[PDB]
Amino acid sequence: TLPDPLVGADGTRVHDRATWQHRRRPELLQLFAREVYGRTPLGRPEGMVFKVTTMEHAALGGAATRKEVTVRFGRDPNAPSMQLLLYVPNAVIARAERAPVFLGLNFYGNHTVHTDPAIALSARWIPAEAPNGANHRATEAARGSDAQKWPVEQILARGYAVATVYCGDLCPDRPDGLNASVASWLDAAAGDQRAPDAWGAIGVWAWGLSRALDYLETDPLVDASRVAVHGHSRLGKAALWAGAQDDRFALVISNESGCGGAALSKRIHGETVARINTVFPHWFARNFRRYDDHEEALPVDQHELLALVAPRPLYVASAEDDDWADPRGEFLAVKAAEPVFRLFGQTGPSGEDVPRVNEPSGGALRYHIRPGPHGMTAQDWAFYLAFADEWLKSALP
Ligand SMILES: O=C(O)[C@H]1O[C@H](O)[C@H](O)[C@@H](O)[C@@H]1O
Ligand SMILES: [Mg+2]
Ligand code: NA
């Protein structure tokens, strides 16, 4: 039995949007920070610098303006940074209009999201599982190696810019990666051991998404008030945490994020807390290991993470064969967060059980399950683009 998002920690019921926004939301944010993801130690750091390193106005055969931007997290050239790739549809900026944006992290490098040979090859560590990796270094053969998750031309043709950053710029995805990450620079001080409530990879990845948004606020080609933050699987766990913590994100998409993302932990199905923390000990706070094989003691569940997006539109989606993510657990988290969305006048999926494949259900809180295995497909994207067209805040008053 799940904790009620609309009952505060002290037992008092949440009846109105102000109490939600100003009392219950901070309560839940601090529970997720302390017990699951670890504390985000600071939001925007002072002295962030944005350097456009390349700009091409006729990329993708004229369809897009492509920019590469180094986003450095302090003023000294020696502060850590991340490399942002942005494609903006020329049809939109040719009209003297700013484009809305889809923003998400990639798994294996910016050069993998499209074959475009002008994208800078990542100079960072790449995991062995990356396609066409050579001793954890990017190669020309990895270009476009993850393009199936990134239908850039369709996204642009529908009027959206595409922004992305390699998650490994922020925390390399390997158990020792926090030692060479934003986390190791952004405090800890003279200690070697990670604190119990210290953030892990998911928290650092989510922070980078918010830093990317900081950059989009200064870019005159895009409308940073109309940013849909999305991610697949482990990067969808980050996209949910980023969209929950940072209410500037206008729209949030979780593509099969599973355990510690959209899936209920207290439903014991597929991946469990013990399994995710054992295999990926750097992803969550050390404090999350308290709940290994003890999910009943969790003071929150992931439906309350989804509810932290409200009233902003949120899309949670599953794959039919993706038992590990627990599609039903993801759907039931949507249903358990729906009462918060309803508080703000929005509607969630119709019914109490998982919809049929390729039949999305819900208003501003939407769910679909698609056929096939874990992944992010053109079908997923088709549904996300329809959702953005409908619910991504307008450019008008
Ligand atoms: O990111 C992915 O592809 C997935 O990788 C692993 O399977 C992990 O157990 C999942 O939690 C994760 O979602
Ligand atoms: Mg599970
Ligand atoms: Na902008």
Author numbering: 35 to 431
Sentences from the paper on this structure:
Glucuronyl esterases (GEs)4 are enzymes able to cleave ester linkages connecting lignin to glucuronoxylan in the plant cell wall. GEs belong to the α/β-hydrolase superfamily and possess a catalytic triad common with serine-type hydrolases. Here, we have investigated by mutagenesis the residues involved in catalysis and carbohydrate binding in the enzyme OtCE15A and, furthermore, present a series of structures of OtCE15A with different ligands, including monosaccharides and, for the first time in CE15, di- and oligosaccharides.
We determined the structure of the WT OtCE15A in complex with the product GlcA. Relative to the apo-structure previously determined, binding of GlcA resulted in minimal changes in the enzyme's structure (all atom root mean square deviation of 0.639 Å), and the binding of the uronic acid to OtCE15A is very similar to that seen in the structure of the fungal StGE2 (catalytic S213A variant) in complex with the methyl ester of 4-O-MeGlcA. In OtCE15A, the GlcA is positioned by a series of hydrogen bonds: one between the C2 hydroxyl and Trp-358, two between the C2 and C3 hydroxyls with Glu-305, two between the C3 and C4 hydroxyls with Lys-271, and one between C4 hydroxyl and the catalytic serine (Ser-267). The C5 carboxylate is oriented similarly to that observed in the StGE2 complex structure and makes a hydrogen bond to the main-chain nitrogen of a conserved active-site arginine (Arg-268 in OtCE15A and Arg-214 in StGE2), which, as for most α/β-hydrolases, is likely to contribute to forming the oxyanion hole to stabilize the negatively charged transition state during catalysis. A notable difference from the StGE2 complex structure, however, is that the side chain of the conserved arginine in OtCE15A is oriented toward the glucuronic acid and makes two additional hydrogens bonds: one between O5 of the pyranose ring and one of the arginine's Nη atoms and one between the carboxylate and the arginine's Nϵ. Thus, this side chain almost certainly contributes to formation of the oxyanion hole. In all structurally characterized bacterial GEs, the arginine appears to be locked in place by a conserved aspartate (Asp-207 in OtCE15A), whereas the equivalent residue in the two solved fungal structures is a glutamine and results in the arginine side chain in those structures being rotated away from the uronic acid–binding site.
